[PDB]
Paper text:
Smo consists of an extracellular N-terminal region containing a cysteine rich domain ([name]), a heptahelical transmembrane segment (7TM) and an intracellular C-terminal tail (C-term). Smo belongs to the G-protein coupled receptor (GPCR) superfamily of proteins, most closely related to the Frizzled (Fz) group of Wnt receptors. In the absence of Hh ligands, Ptch1 inhibits the function of Smo, a 7-pass TM protein that is encoded by a human oncogene. Our work now shows that the Smo [name] in vertebrates binds to oxysterols and mediates the ability of these lipids to activate Hh signaling.
Although we set-up crystallization trials with the entire zSmo ectodomain (residues 29–212), the N- and C-terminal regions could not be traced due to missing electron density and thus were not included in the final model. The small interface between the two zSmo [name] molecules observed in the asymmetric unit of the crystal (buried surface area of 490 Å2) and a crystal contact formed by a zinc ion bonded to three different protein chains (one chain A and two chain B molecules) suggested that the dimeric arrangement observed in the crystal is not likely to be of functional significance. In agreement with this crystal packing analysis, purified zSmo ectodomain behaved as a monomer in solution at low concentration (5 µM) when assessed using multi angle light scattering. To investigate the putative oxysterol binding site in the Smo [name], we calculated the volumes of potential binding pockets in our zSmo [name] structure. The most prominent groove is indeed located at an equivalent position to the Fz8 palmitoleyl-binding groove.
Numbering used by the authors: 41 to 158
Write the structure that this text describes.
């Protein structure tokens, strides 16, 4: 329940939004707007507008990477934490005005963002 069972695929990129990754396997099961890694790349660049607000970017960048390019290992993908999600709501509240959060990026989604597994 802190992880989701899935089939891992080899990462086509070694970088998520500037950050080098310490893993080479991923899954697209968490990003409900992407079916391929090439689509996840496109959607990730779409979120890169939040760079102009450092206090938003500091928390939203690790979260988006945990959703779009998460670590897959031994048939399981890791789930992003509820604490990390809630930290984004306030400094990134501009999203609510401009487009709103997708269901897979809402904190009320307890199966996507469970608490405990930090
Ligand atoms: Na998907
Ligand atoms: Zn491998």
């Amino acid at each position: 329940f802190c992880k989701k069972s899935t089939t891992c695929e080899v990462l086509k990129y070694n970088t998520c939004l500037g950050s080098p990754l310490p893993y080479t396997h991923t899954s697209l099961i968490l990003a409900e707007d992407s079916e391929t890694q090439e689509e996840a790349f496109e959607k990730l660049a779409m979120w890169s507008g939040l760079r102009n607000a450092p206090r938003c970017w500091a928390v939203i960048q690790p979260l988006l990477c945990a959703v779009y390019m998460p670590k897959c290992e031994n048939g399981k993908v890791e789930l992003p934490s509820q604490h990390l999600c809630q930290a984004t709501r306030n400094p990134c509240s501009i999203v609510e005005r401009e487009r709103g959060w997708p269901n897979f990026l809402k904190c009320e989604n307890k199966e996507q963002f469970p608490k405990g597994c930090q």
